[PDB]
Amino acid sequence: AGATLSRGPAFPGMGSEELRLASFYDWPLTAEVPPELLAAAGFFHTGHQDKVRCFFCYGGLQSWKRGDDPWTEHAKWFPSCQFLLRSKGRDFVHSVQET
Numbered sequence: 383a384g385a386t387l388s389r390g391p392a393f394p395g396m397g398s399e400e401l402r403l404a405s406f407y408d409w410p411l412t413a414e415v416p417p418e419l420l421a422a423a424g425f426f427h428t429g430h431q432d433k434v435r436c437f438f439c440y441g442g443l444q445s446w447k448r449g450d451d452p453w454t455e456h457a458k459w460f461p462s463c464q465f466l467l468r469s470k471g472r473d474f475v476h477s478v479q480e481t
């Protein structure tokens with residue numbers, strides 16, 4: 383019983399936080415979340431608005447707002463992301479899912 387989550391990042395090149403940070407060179411003025419937090423949480427910027435995708439699970443998120451925690455949003459929407467899980471642990475993700 384049970385298929386396994388594949389281990390390959392959706393976008394291995396964006397596996398680097400530094401490179402993910404570069405993607406936010408045009409992260410909008412009206413956008414309310416710091417790129418550093420987004421890049422740290424595995425997200426890189428796509429498009430020209432405020433859309434991001436996780437380099438690993440490819441979870442796509444937009445409509446970012448003051449206070450929005452990237453790591454939390456990550457756990458909220460993409461709880462099985464192996465990047466999120468290695469970085470924040472099983473406890474953290476469960477803690478976000480159970481609320």
Ligand SMILES: [Zn+2]
Pocket residue numbers: 424436437438439440441456460463464465466
């Ligand atoms: Zn992810």
